[PDB]
RNA sequence: CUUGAGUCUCGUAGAGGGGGGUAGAAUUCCAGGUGUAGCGGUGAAAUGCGUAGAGAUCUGGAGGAAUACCGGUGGCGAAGGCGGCCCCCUGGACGAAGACUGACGCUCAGGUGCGAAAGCGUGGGGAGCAAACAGGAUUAGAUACCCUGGUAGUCCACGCCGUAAACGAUGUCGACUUGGAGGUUGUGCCCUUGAGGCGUGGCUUCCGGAGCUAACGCGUUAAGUCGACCGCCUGGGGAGUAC
């Protein structure tokens, strides 16, 4: 498989869904013969610019390792989900853990 | 390019011994794979020329090797062209 | 570019931001573009910067 | 007769002319000036000391309220990016923040070929 | 440096305009300059850092 | 047989290519608020736009093209060319311990393929720019330069056309031959205590010695000393024209 690192920022007034969103994704990854060696909840915070309006959003990281196939399934559930304002996921670059 | 679990795999199928990544029988066969595999890639995109240049490279480069075998051991040639379904 | 100071006075601080953009990358546009004229004059003016 | 108290002032600094409008906080026109309308026209304007007399004319149309303080919005290059702010500092107005709102793209549209003599 | 979360060690390589500081006044071994800029770009999407300044 | 050439391993840098996403700045336009007699343009002017309310300003929306800064005397590519961030498919280059094959190589008429821009066909798209065209100005005249507009086109797909000062105006491959300063990227090593210091490869700038050259100049990336193969020249015009 190939490592990853996805940081999704969900709408500020939908934070309560963030915790639930994590379980789904995480569960899938685990059920995809993958691994999760990084995780952190940044919560709400001011933005550089009012990206997609407002001036704050909920941040979360990841840095998985699951097979590209199953992660490509994420872009869909990510797009078709007004909760999440912006999506941004880079490639492997070898397992990343702690710090951040 | 090609995956190790495949490259280091095939080498142990045509090599007249062990870890003989040099052997024509090996190298040559190793070329067909990356070639056949790319044919599915070039089926898409098409306009991607800079990648075909390398494709053609390994193709002619493969032929340069086939001619050699014929000029070093007639048998080995016809004995390998089959295992690779070459000539077409 | 963002100024702001206590104690009313028209000192300046303004020409501080006048070193990153300002009337430069402005007139840079102004008229037409460049295309080949730059890649060339940009690589000739470089020769100047030698001595 | 509204008494905006404080409102930013846009300084459309251009070459062939310069104009400053003392708009309100939200961005409503309260009083605008103009070099072309400042006696001298043709092209005699432009020059800084010519725009200063223009924007200063606002303190005659926007003075009906009582602007006790105001910011400054300088846009575009030309002889009127400094002059304006100066004349305003003497007119009696205050100041809250100076800034350049000149439209600096990222290689978007392709500017006009133009000029070639 | 190869990231964007390290927003802490980036505000130094910019200015009141959030513009990527040149390598002239940095001499950041070049190879690093390349990486340093790449971060400031992608990092701006996560609103971690600003693009311009007027907005 | 192994040093040429190639394979394997593990790393490294890259605007190499094809596909799909996505972001921010700006322009234009549509709508509405504020506000009022100018705006725009030039050397001046005028056409043009303005009291049916422009310009300015602010809020919301639509759309297309290109990606400031980083950006460099930088990098990648056979050439043409290739700059936002992200993912997917993919090519080449280089270094190092090495392990492997064993001359499998160099060049290449004909042949096949790739080719800036402009142009062509079908269908899309169209913000800005702009051949044509139309006004205004300049002038002796002005079928121009300048100004106000503006259509093809520029953008996308797919197919065609094959040209360029397609330029290093310098064919590809290999071996030799004083030096100096620098750039970029790999690797070994050094109280690795450091920005760092010493080597050893790749690519690349500038100066320059011998030599070469008609001179300018080229000068280890040669236009120097040699070897292998290919393309080409034989006065100017007529003519890259006629058939």
Curated annotation (Swiss-Prot), chain A:
Q: How does it assemble?
A: Part of the 30S ribosomal subunit. Interacts weakly with uL2 in one of the 3.5 A resolved structures.
Q: Which GO terms describe its cellular component?
A: cytoplasm; cytosol; cytosolic small ribosomal subunit
Membership in a protein family = Belongs to the bacterial ribosomal protein bS6 family.
Molecular function in Gene Ontology: mRNA 5'-UTR binding; small ribosomal subunit rRNA binding; structural constituent of ribosome
In what way is this protein post-translationally modified? 5 different forms of the protein, varying only in the number of C-terminal glutamate residues, were isolated. The sequence shown is form bS6-6, which is the longest. The first two Glu are encoded by the rpsF gene, the other Glu are added post-translationally by the RimK enzyme.
Please provide the Gene Ontology terms (biological process) for this protein.
cytoplasmic translation
Keywords of the record? Acetylation, Ribonucleoprotein, Ribosomal protein, RNA-binding, rRNA-binding
Query: This chain belongs to which protein, by name?
Result: Small ribosomal subunit protein bS6
Q: Does the keyword Acetylation apply?
A: yes
At what positions is N6-acetyllysine found?
93
Sum up the protein's function in the record's words: Binds together with bS18 to 16S ribosomal RNA.
Organism of this sequence:
Escherichia coli (strain K12)
Does the record carry Acetylation as a key word?
yes
From Swiss-Prot, chain B:
Keywords from UniProt, A to Z, are: Ribonucleoprotein, Ribosomal protein, RNA-binding, rRNA-binding, Translation regulation
Induction info reads: Part of the metY operon that extends to pnp, also has its own promoter.
**Annotated Gene Ontology MF terms?**
rRNA binding; small ribosomal subunit rRNA binding; structural constituent of ribosome
- Which cysteines form disulfides? none
List the PANTHER family hit by this protein, alphabetically.
RIBOSOMAL PROTEIN S15, BACTERIAL AND ORGANELLAR (PTHR23321), SMALL RIBOSOMAL SUBUNIT PROTEIN US15M (PTHR23321:SF26)
Q: How does it assemble?
A: Part of the 30S ribosomal subunit. Forms a bridge to the 50S subunit in the 70S ribosome, contacting the 23S rRNA.
Q: What is this protein called?
A: Small ribosomal subunit protein uS15
Its source organism is: Escherichia coli (strain K12)
Q: Which gene encodes it?
A: rpsO
From Swiss-Prot, chain C:
**Gene Ontology terms, cellular component aspect?**
cytoplasm; cytosol; cytosolic small ribosomal subunit
Compositionally biased residues, Basic residues: 43-51
One of the protein's GO biological processes: ribosomal small subunit assembly
Single GO MF annotation: rRNA binding
Keywords attached to this entry: Ribonucleoprotein, Ribosomal protein, RNA-binding, rRNA-binding
Family, similarity comment: Belongs to the bacterial ribosomal protein bS21 family.
Protein task: Probbly involved in recognition of ribosome rescue factor SmrB in stalled/collided disomes; fusion of protein fragments to its N-terminus decreases ribosome rescue in the presence of SmrB.
Q: What is this protein called?
A: Small ribosomal subunit protein bS21
Shown stretch of the complete protein: 4 to 54 of 71
From Swiss-Prot, chain D:
GO cellular component terms given for this protein: cytoplasm; cytosol; cytosolic small ribosomal subunit
GO MF annotation list:
small ribosomal subunit rRNA binding; structural constituent of ribosome
Q: Which Gene3D superfamilies does the UniProt entry name for this protein?
A: Ribosomal protein S11
Q: Which family does it belong to?
A: Belongs to the universal ribosomal protein uS11 family.
State the NCBIfam families in the record: PRK05309.1, uS11_bact
Q: What else is known?
A: Has been predicted to contact the N-terminal domain of IF-3 based on footprint studies; exactly how IF-3 interacts with the 30S subunit is controversial.
From the Swiss-Prot or TrEMBL record, give the protein name: Small ribosomal subunit protein uS11
Q: Which organism is it from?
A: Escherichia coli (strain K12)
Q: In the record, what lineage is assigned to the organism producing the protein?
A: Bacteria, Pseudomonadati, Pseudomonadota, Gammaproteobacteria, Enterobacterales
The encoding gene is rpsK
């Amino acid at each position: 498989m190939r490592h990853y690192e996805i940081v999704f920022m969900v709408h500020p007034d939908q934070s309560e869904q963030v915790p639930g969103m994590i379980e789904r994704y995480t569960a899938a990854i685990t059920g995809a013969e993958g691994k999760i060696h990084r995780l952190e909840d940044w919560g709400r915070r001011q933005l550089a610019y009012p990206i997609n309006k407002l001036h704050k959003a909920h941040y979360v990281l990841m840095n998985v390792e699951a097979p590209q196939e199953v992660i490509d399934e994420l872009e869909t559930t990510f797009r078709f989900n007004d909760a999440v304002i912006r999506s941004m996921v880079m490639r492997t670059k070898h397992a990343v853990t702690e710090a951040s | 390019s090609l995956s190790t679990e495949a490259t280091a795999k095939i080498v142990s199928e045509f090599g007249r011994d062990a870890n003989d990544t040099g052997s024509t029988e090996v190298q040559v066969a190793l070329l067909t794979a990356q070639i056949n595999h790319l044919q599915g890639h070039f089926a898409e995109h098409k306009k991607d020329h800079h990648s075909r240049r390398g494709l053609l490279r390994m193709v002619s480069q493969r032929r340069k090797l086939l001619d050699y075998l014929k000029r070093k051991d007639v048998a080995r040639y016809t004995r390998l062209i089959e295992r690779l379904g070459l000539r077409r | 570019i963002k100024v702001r100071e206590n104690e009313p006075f028209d000192v300046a601080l303004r020409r501080f931001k006048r070193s990153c953009e300002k009337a430069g990358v402005l007139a840079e546009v102004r008229r037409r573009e460049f295309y080949e004229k730059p890649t060339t004059e940009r690589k000739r003016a470089k020769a100047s910067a030698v001595k | 007769r509204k008494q905006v108290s404080d409102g930013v002032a846009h300084i459309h600094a251009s070459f062939n002319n310069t104009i400053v409008t003392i708009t309100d906080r939200q961005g409503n026109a309260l009083g605008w000036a103009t070099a072309g309308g400042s006696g001298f026209r043709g092209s005699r304007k432009s020059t800084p000391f010519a725009a200063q007399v223009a924007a200063e004319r606002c303190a005659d149309a926007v003075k009906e309220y009582g602007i006790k303080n105001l910011e400054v919005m300088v846009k575009g290059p030309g002889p009127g990016r400094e002059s304006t702010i100066r004349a305003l500092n003497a007119a009696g107005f205050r100041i809250t923040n100076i800034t350049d709102v000149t439209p600096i793209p990222h290689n978007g549209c392709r500017p006009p070929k133009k000029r070639r003599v | 440096e190869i990231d964007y979360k390290d927003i802490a060690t980036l505000k130094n390589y910019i200015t009141e305009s959030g513009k990527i500081v040149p390598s002239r006044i940095t001499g950041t071994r070049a190879k690093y300059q390349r990486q340093l800029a790449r971060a400031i770009k992608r990092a701006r999407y996560l609103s971690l850092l600003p693009y311009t300044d007027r907005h």
